[PDB]
Amino acid sequence: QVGVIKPWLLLGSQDAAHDLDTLKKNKVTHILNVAYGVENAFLSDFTYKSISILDLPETNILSYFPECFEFIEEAKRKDGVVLVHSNAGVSAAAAIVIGFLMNSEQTSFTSAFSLVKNARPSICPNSGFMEQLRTYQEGKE
Amino acid sequence: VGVIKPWLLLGSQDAAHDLDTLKKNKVTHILNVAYGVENAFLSDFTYKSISILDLPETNILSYFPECFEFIEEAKRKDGVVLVHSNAGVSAAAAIVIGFLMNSEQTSFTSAFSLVKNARPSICPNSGFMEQLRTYQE
């Protein structure tokens, strides 16, 4: 299962990452895998990047922005389509997508959150991720 | 937090760390199937932890003896158990679905529906769904 945030920006679970037919139907070109233990199943069909982002409040989600956002922008620059996925893809993967929208569109946490939540209503970033994103633009700590 | 029964609750790591809500809901027992979530309130609740990776290769059925024994103990003592994982959407949900099937002889579809109505964000992975579909067939 897949949220279409933009036509080129998708958010989903590990099951999305392993559903070839739907990856093709959505014209996926790039897959950002922030899960644990999820094999990149289709090496010949997609450009993959992995980065471990554990679903804990202690994870520093902001730390991952340079690497993750460069990849997303790579997909976009090439007029492709990137799927960001994790295990359940409701928390860490959601937070990366929210942050990306915040930075790429210079939009607020609440605006970006709303865009993701409408596209994938099962999102529920952990409290630490919410605090980290809510106070990123203001520069807390 | 999803209220599956007044004594069976399903939630996230944030529910496990919210003492005020835990006490409002009369929790007594916490079954922690998360990774990396400290059992914060040892003097207030009875905790049991079990590692359950959210991967389709995980054998969810293997965890049922340990998990269900604990849930049954909370129930026998007229307490209230919170089952939680990290997001509370996949393995913790699978445990709750399986528990209704096992304790109540409920069908998979009915049990799944009960859990999904109490917590619409649930989505056990493809492996867990197939394991639960054929459980007690």
Side-chain angles (χ1 to χ4, degrees), chain A residues 1-140, chain B:
Chain A
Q1 207 161 1
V2 174
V4 183
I5 314 302
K6 309 287 191 161
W8 50 275
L9 183 65
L10 312 180
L11 176 58
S13 76
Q14 62 194 128
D15 288 313
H18 285 173
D19 175 12
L20 188 53
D21 287 353
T22 75
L23 296 168
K24 293 224 205 100
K25 191 221 355 271
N26 295 322
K27 306 305 153 82
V28 174
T29 58
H30 291 247
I31 302 174
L32 177 56
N33 180 347
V34 311
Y36 55 89
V38 176
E39 295 177 18
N40 295 331
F42 308 117
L43 300 184
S44 73
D45 278 316
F46 311 103
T47 297
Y48 285 88
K49 182 176 188 80
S50 296
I51 302 277
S52 176
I53 305 185
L54 293 179
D55 182 19
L56 295 165
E58 298 83 16
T59 294
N60 176 356
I61 195 76
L62 310 178
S63 73
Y64 307 99
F65 284 6
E67 293 168 286
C68 291
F69 295 175
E70 186 65 7
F71 186 79
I72 295 166
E73 294 276 4
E74 242 284 317
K76 193 192 176 203
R77 190 186 61 67
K78 292 186 174 277
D79 295 323
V81 171
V82 59
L83 167 66
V84 183
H85 78 88
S86 188
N87 294 80
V90 297
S91 177
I96 289 292
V97 172
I98 291 164
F100 176 81
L101 289 174
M102 285 170 70
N103 294 79
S104 64
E105 307 191 341
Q106 296 291 304
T107 76
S108 59
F109 169 67
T110 62
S111 290
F113 184 94
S114 294
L115 222 154
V116 179
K117 181 72 169 173
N118 291 335
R120 183 162 170 79
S122 62
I123 72 150
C124 195
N126 75 57
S127 64
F129 299 160
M130 293 297 281
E131 174 67 0
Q132 295 170 57
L133 292 173
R134 277 204 210 91
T135 67
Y136 174 70
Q137 291 176 147
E138 78 174 346
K140 185 55 185 308
Chain B
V1 21
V3 180
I4 318 299
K5 318 281 195 171
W7 50 275
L8 181 59
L9 308 186
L10 174 57
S12 79
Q13 68 194 123
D14 288 320
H17 285 171
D18 180 358
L19 186 54
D20 292 346
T21 305
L22 297 169
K23 279 178 168 189
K24 253 122 206 155
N25 294 331
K26 301 201 95 202
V27 180
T28 63
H29 291 247
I30 295 175
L31 177 56
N32 178 346
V33 305
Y35 62 88
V37 181
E38 293 179 10
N39 295 335
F41 309 117
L42 294 179
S43 69
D44 292 298
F45 315 103
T46 292
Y47 283 88
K48 183 172 194 169
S49 299
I50 296 285
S51 177
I52 309 185
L53 295 181
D54 181 27
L55 290 171
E57 298 76 25
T58 296
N59 179 6
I60 195 80
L61 302 186
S62 79
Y63 304 100
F64 281 5
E66 296 172 280
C67 289
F68 292 2
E69 177 193 319
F70 187 79
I71 294 165
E72 289 292 6
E73 176 206 310
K75 186 193 185 187
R76 167 199 324 117
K77 302 192 182 208
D78 284 333
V80 168
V81 54
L82 170 59
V83 182
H84 79 85
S85 58
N86 288 68
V89 302
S90 183
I95 293 297
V96 174
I97 297 158
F99 173 78
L100 294 173
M101 302 180 64
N102 184 89
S103 55
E104 298 177 1
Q105 320 320 133
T106 306
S107 58
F108 163 70
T109 64
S110 183
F112 176 82
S113 300
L114 226 138
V115 184
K116 186 74 161 167
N117 282 348
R119 188 162 177 86
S121 59
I122 67 141
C123 187
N125 79 54
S126 60
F128 293 166
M129 288 301 291
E130 176 58 21
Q131 299 164 49
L132 294 167
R133 189 181 76 79
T134 56
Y135 182 55
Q136 294 182 340
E137 243 190 6

